[PDB]
Amino acid sequence: STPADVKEHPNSYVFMVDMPGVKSGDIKVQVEDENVLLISGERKREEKEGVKYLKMERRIGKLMRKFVLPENANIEAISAISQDGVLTVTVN
Amino acid sequence: STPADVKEHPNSYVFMVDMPGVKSGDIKVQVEDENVLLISGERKREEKEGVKYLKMERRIGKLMRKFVLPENANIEAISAISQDGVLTVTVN
Numbered sequence: 001s002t003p004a005d006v007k008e009h010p011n012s013y014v015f016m017v018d019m020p021g022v023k024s025g026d027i028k029v030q031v032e033d034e035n036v037l038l039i040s041g042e043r044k045r046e047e048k049e050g051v052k053y054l055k056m057e058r059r060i061g062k063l064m065r066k067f068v069l070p071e072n073a074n075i076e077a078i079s080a081i082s083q084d085g086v087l088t089v090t091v092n
Numbered sequence: 093s094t095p096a097d098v099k100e101h102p103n104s105y106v107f108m109v110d111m112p113g114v115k116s117g118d119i120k121v122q123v124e125d126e127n128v129l130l131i132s133g134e135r136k137r138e139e140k141e142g143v144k145y146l147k148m149e150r151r152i153g154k155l156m157r158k159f160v161l162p163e164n165a166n167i168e169a170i171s172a173i174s175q176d177g178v179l180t181v182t183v184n
Contacts, residue, residue: 003112003150003151005149006146006148007143007145008146009142009143016150018112018150019176020095020112021176021177022176050102051100053099054098054099054105055096055097056098057095057096058095058096058108084112084114084176084177085112085176085177085178
C-alpha cells in the first residue's frame, strides 16, 4: 500500500499516488473489468563492491492500490504521469 | 521525517532519502558546522476551480533529516541527485 489522493474535475477523475524510487517500466496502470483502476509499482535495490550499508530504512517491494469507479462507468481515456516519485493518473 | 538509506563507498558516503512530490528548488542540502549534513524538502498542494477532492491521504509539509559524520571529517565535495522522488547525496 501507498498514499493516494483522488480529485474530481468536471469531466475526469485524478489519482495521485506516492511512488518514490519506482522506475517507469516498473509502473503498472491497468483496468480490471472496465470499472476498477489498478495502480502498481515496485521499488528495487541498487545492487558489496566494496560498498557497505550503514543505515537502511527505505523498505522496497511493490506498492499497489485499487480504485473502483461506479459501475457502468467505462474507462476509455486514461492518462499517466510520473514525476518526482508521484504518479498522476487521469481517468475519464 | 522521511526514510533514509546510508551507504559507505571507498572514498565517499551516500545518503538516499525518499521525497515524493518535492520539486527541486524546494530541496535543501546543507552543511552545518562542517560535520553535519542537513537534507530538507517540502511537498506542496496543487491549488476549487470546479475541482473537488474525494480522497486525501498524502500529507504535505517538510521532510527533513540530519546526518552527522565524524568530527574532523570535512565536507568539501558534495553531490546531489533528484530522481523519481529519491534524493541521493554523496559526500566526501
